[PDB]
Structure formats: structure tokens, C-alpha cells
């Protein structure tokens, strides 16, 4: 909107009321915290959301960081442009005084004049009339400046990491600015989101632009360069494995490019190869790029870092700080099993709880926005773009790590609960510190992080995908550089030919089986429809469900004990994943 001085009106009972004043300068709206207390400001032809606040000094900025930089030099005539409610604007001159506790004008102005600009002879704002003598309220240091984006990053053989911390305006401003630039430059453009719900949020921010969401139910879909493709990471990788009609995108943008999921890692591998070939430009957006090991990064809004005991199971006494908290809380658990116990403990105390996991995310997450709740109990999945209007994060900093055991018959176990990585701790904490609130957001944690993901099964599974992905030219795709030495797996040792490769893709896509487990079955020469391997494993490969031995009724109508030839912990780690794998073993999908 237009630069100048604005009355801040509040629609109350039987009429609007000037609760304050504000100054829009260089594109951002400045005022005082006690006037709007974080609330959104409505304009005809516009919407204004807060971006920065200093509650202690009573200041708040809309649409960017504080930009008023001029200050008052003692013994200088100032001028308060007083905007009193129901009265015409007035220029009042006076000579201000001195400080006392950690420059105040002796002007008596009605309540509602708070936020009126204080101006020197140069017509620059040197402060805001506020705290009733009334102190010339000014920020010690301005922004927190400008953008995070908009160079000539649209060049072949250039890959850009955008380190965008929450509150950056990534989705609302940065991403649509990128797409507009790509379309001006006539670049065939692909956008990659970690989840459907995030992809849907991109569609909203990108409204008005030629965007097309690409379902994984389809191997390829082509109109032309004028259409921008949008899809989940996993969708892109499955297409790379399923189709030879993958378009040679000129610009590939990956959001939440830290996602350690095998499909996501393989995607960053292929993407990087395309950039290297001189074919494409790529942009990886993440607040924790490779090399970032600070659990406590900066945030656009202050975060209170509190370290104390956190329960891993149901409690009965000693943790009143958990349930006495008035606001909303996001709690990160090491597993769904752990999540269910915590959630039930909280629900027993009358707390409304939403639970989140990988497979329930796209159906449960929309409830956090719409319905009213107290706690979110989530797995590491919410480390990829999940946004919450919460004030607190409870983070025991623990997780389960899938590991391929080589001692004895090869199998995948879930090690832990083990301490999370520094990046993950930063992402978890990063759920808060976004939106200015009266009290600082709280990050309640326990334990230190650990850089021990070198034996993580995901890096090997990514290579099982990668050397089963071809490029039209013949070039071999490897892991993204900074991730390349996170596995000791040999290159092209997981390559599959012919129908083996086809089965491998189908075991993953239609079977919903883990990459490792899919690869083992496929390289064995087993057909997709055949499920006899689910019952012919060794006794020690027996699968348990709630302390009881699983017994499946086959498609034929036979009752056999569930006992896979290859054991992968992730297919029985939770009632839902097991329920799914039993549908597979029965041959119902």
C-alpha cells in the first residue's frame, strides 16, 4: 500500500475505534506491540501479517523487518505528528529528555495516538510516540533486511541452496516469485514438495499461475513448457523408475530438501546429475542445508530454550508443567508406539490430542488447522514443512534408525530410541519461533543431538533406487555430493535388469514395501503376484503382533504363520504398517 501515516481502527461494539497509529515505510508497516498485539491487519486490496516483534520494547513490524533507522541526536527539535482519534492530524514540536533504567517527549496525547511518528527536520522517522513523559520508541537495530532470493540463479550448471528459516516468506512470496521468473524465461519447470499437504499449500500460494499437480497414479503427463509441474518427491523418483518419458526440466525446485527419505535422497541425486550435465538449474530450499549442525539456529521470533526431564511413557506424577501449559504443544515421539502411549496419557488428563505419522499425515494434519486441539503428538514426519500455530515444542530428541544388519542373515532392524541428528533437532525446534506472540515460544528439550546417521539404511536404499534410474544420454546418476559419503555402498551394485527391475518398482509402488525389502524379493527373481516368501522364512523370522504370533489366511483359503524369507522391521513396527503388509501377504493387493 501507500507510504504514510495510518490510523489503526478496531471493529468493536457499535463502531470502529482508533486503537493506535502506524507508519508504512519502504514497504513495511510499523507500529507498537500493545496496539495490535500480533493480530492481522486488514486493508482493502490487501492483507498484512506480522513478521517481526519486540514485545519488551513494544514494537511490531508487518511485511518485513523494522526499517526505521534514523535516530535522535540529543538537543535537537523533534516533531510528533500526533494522530488523535476523532481529531485532525497535528504537528507538535517539543524538546525531549533523557533515559533512566536499562529520550522522552513531555507530550500528553489521548490513548489511541500510540504509534504516531516522531520526526526530525529531515522528514525521517526517529521513533514512535508510545509509552506513557513518553519515550521516543525506536529499535536499536533495523532488519533482518530485504529478501532471501532473486539473483541470476537461473543459469545452466548452477545448483542453489536457499537456507530459508521459517518466517522467511518462502511459500507466500519467494516461491511464486521464482515461478514467475521461470515462466518469463520459458523454463520447463518442476516443483517438488515433501508431502501432498505441502504441495496443496503451494497450489494456494501459486494460485493464478499455470500449475499442474502430478499424481503418482500416472507415470507421465505432458502438455508443454507453459505448464509448471508440481509433485511429491517420491512421485518424481517413481516416475524416473517407471517411465522413459520424463521431461528434461530446465529448472527443478525441491522444497524441504533435507528430507532423508530414500526416494527424496535419490531424487536429489538425479537432480544434481542433470545440473552437472549442463542441462538444468536447480534450487534446494531447506533451513538445514548439508553442513548445518546448529541445533539452536536464529529465528525470526524469539525462542525460549528449556532443558528438562521429558517422559518417554505414561506418567502419573511429576510433570505438571506439561499439562499446566495454557497454549498449544507439538510433541515429537521416537515412534508411533511411543506416540500412542503419550497421547493416551494426555487424553486421560482431558487434553485434546491429534496424532501424526507418515501414513496418516495427509488425513490427520488438516485437522490441526481446522479443529481446536491442545497437543500434537508426531513422529519425525513433521520435520518436513508441517506448520502449526503452537507456542511450545516438546522434543525428547529421540528417534528410531533403520539399519541393515550384516551379522548373520541380512535383515533390517529399527535401532533405538537413539538421539536425533543436529539438523533434525533444528527442524523440530523450527516448528516454533515463526509467529510473534506475547510470550516467547518455548522449546522444551532433553539430551544433546548426535551425528550418527552413517549406518542409516536410507543411504543404501537411495542407491538401490539411483542405480536403477537411467538417464536418456547414458550418464550414471550418483548421490548428491554432500550426501555421497554417507554410505559405503558400491556404485551400481544394486542394478537390476529386465523384469526384475519392473517387479522391484511394483513391489514399492503397488506393494507399499520398503526399498530394501522390495529389492531383496525382486533380485530373487520372484514375481509380484507370488507371496509364498511371506511364509517360508526361518522360525526366527516369525512376526509378532501385540505379543502374539501373526497367522494369515492366504488367498487360496489356507491359514499359515506370517514368517517372511526376508525380515524388514518397518513392515511390523506399528498396527497400520502391519495391517498393510498382511494385506500383501494375503495377496489382496
Amino acid at each position: 500500500l501507500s507510504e504514510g501515516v495510518y490510523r489503526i481502527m478496531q471493529r468493536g461494539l457499535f463502531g470502529k475505534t482508533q486503537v493506535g497509529v502506524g507508519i508504512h515505510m519502504e514497504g513495511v508497516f510499523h507500529t507498537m506491540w500493545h496496539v495490535t498485539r500480533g493480530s492481522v491487519i486488514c486493508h482493502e486490496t490487501g492483507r498484512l501479517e506480522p513478521s517481526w516483534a519486540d514485545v519488551r520494547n513494544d514494537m511490531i513490524s508487518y511485511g518485513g523487518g523494522w526499517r526505521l533507522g534514523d535516530k535522535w541526536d540529543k538537543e535537537e527539535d523533534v516533531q510528533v505528528l500526533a494522530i488523535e482519534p476523532g481529531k485532525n492530524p497535528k504537528h507538535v514540536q517539543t524538546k525531549p529528555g533523557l533515559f533512566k533504567t536499562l529520550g522522552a517527549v513531555t507530550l500528553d496525547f489521548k490513548p489511541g495516538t500510540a504509534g504516531s511518528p516522531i520526526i526530525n527536520k529531515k522528514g525521517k522517522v526517529i521513533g514512535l510516540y508510545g509509552n506513557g513523559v513518553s519515550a521516543i520508541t525506536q529499535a536499536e537495530r533495523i532488519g533482518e533486511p530485504d529478501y532471501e532470493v532473486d539473483e541470476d540463479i537461473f543459469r545452466k550448471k548452477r545448483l542453489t541452496i536457499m537456507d530459508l528459516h521459517p518466517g522467511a516468506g518462502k511459500t507466500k512470496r519467494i516461491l511464486p516469485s521464482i515461478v514467475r521468473e521461470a515462466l518469463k524465461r520459458r523454463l520447463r519447470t518442476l516443483i517438488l514438495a515433501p508431502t501432498r499437504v505441502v504441495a496443496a499449500e503451494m497450489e494456494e500460494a501459486l494460485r493464478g499461475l499455470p500449475i499442474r499437480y502430478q499424481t503418482p497414479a500416472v507415470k507421465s503427463e505432458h502438455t508443454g513448457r507453459e505448464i509448471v509441474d508440481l509433485m511429491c518427491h517420491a512421485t518424481f523418483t517413481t516416475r524416473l523408475l517407471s517411465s522413459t518419458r520424463v521431461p528434461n526440466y530446465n529448472l527443478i525446485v525441491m522444497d524441504e530438501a533435507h528430507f532423508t527419505d530414500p526416494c527424496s535422497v535419490a531424487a536429489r541425486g538425479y537432480i544434481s546429475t542433470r545440473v552437472e550435465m549442463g542441462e538444468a538449474a536447480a534450487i534446494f530450499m531447506t533451513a538445514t542445508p548439508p553442513g548445518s549442525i546448529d541445533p539452536f539456529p536464529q529465528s525470526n521470533s524469539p525462542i525460549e530454550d528449556i532443558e528438562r526431564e521429558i517422559p518417554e511413557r505414561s506418567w502419573n506424577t511429576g510433570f505438571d508443567w506439561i499439562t499446566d501449559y495454557q497454549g498449544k504443544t507439538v510433541w515429537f515421539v521416537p515412534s508411533i508406539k511411543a506416540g500412542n502411549d503419550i497421547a493416551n496419557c494426555l487424553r486421560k488428563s482431558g487434553k485434546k490430542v491429534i496424532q501424526l505419522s507418515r501414513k496418516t499425515f495427509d488425513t490427520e494434519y488438516p485437522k490441526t488447522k481446522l479443529t481446536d486441539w491442545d497437543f500434537v503428538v508426531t513422529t519425525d514426519i513433521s520435520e518436513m514443512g508441517a506448520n502449526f500455530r503452537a507456542g511450545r515444542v516438546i522434543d525428547p530428541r529421540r528417534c528410531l534408525k533403520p539399519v541393515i544388519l550384516t551379522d548373520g542373515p541380512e535383515r533390517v532392524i529399527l535401532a533405538g530410541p537413539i538421539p536425533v541428528t543436529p539438523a533434525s533437532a533444528a527442524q523440530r525446534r523450527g516448528r516454533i519461533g515463526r509467529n510473534p506472540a506475547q510470550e516467547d515460544d518455548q522449546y522444551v528439550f532433553s539430551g544433546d543431538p548426535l551425528k550418527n546417521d552413517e549406518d542409516h539404511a536410507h543411504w543404501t536404499e537411495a542407491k538401490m533406487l539411483l542405480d536403477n534410474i537411467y538417464t536418456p544420454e547414458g550418464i550414471i546418476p550418483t548421490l548428491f555430493g554432500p550426501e555421497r559419503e554417507k554410505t559405503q555402498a558400491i556404485d551400481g551394485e544394486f542394478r537390476l535388469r529386465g523384469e526384475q527391475r519392473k517387479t522391484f518398482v511394483e513391489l514399492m509402488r503397488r506393494g507399499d514395501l520398503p526399498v530394501w525389502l522390495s529389492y531383496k524379493v525382486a533380485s530373487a527373481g520372484i514375481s509380484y503376484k507370488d507371496r509364498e516368501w511371506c511364509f517360508t522364512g526361518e522360525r526366527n523370522n516369525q512376526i509378532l503382533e501385540e505379543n502374539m504370533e501373526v497367522e494369515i489366511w492366504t488367498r487360496e483359503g489356507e491359514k499359515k504363520k506370517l514368517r517372511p524369507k526376508w525380515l524388514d522391521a518397518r513392515v511390523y513396527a506399528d498396527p497400520m504398517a502391519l495391517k498393510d503388509f498382511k494385506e500383501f501377504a494375503s495377496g489382496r493387493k
Partner: peptide
């Protein structure tokens, strides 16, 4: 969520 803006004046010094 019920705040709005109406413009009053511009940043200037008075003669």
C-alpha cells in the same frame, strides 16, 4: 482478527 487501516497523513516536517 478485526483490525483495519485508514490513512491520515504523510511523513513531513512543518514550516
Amino acid at each position: 482478527a478485526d483490525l483495519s487501516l485508514e490513512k491520515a497523513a504523510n511523513v513531513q516536517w512543518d514550516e
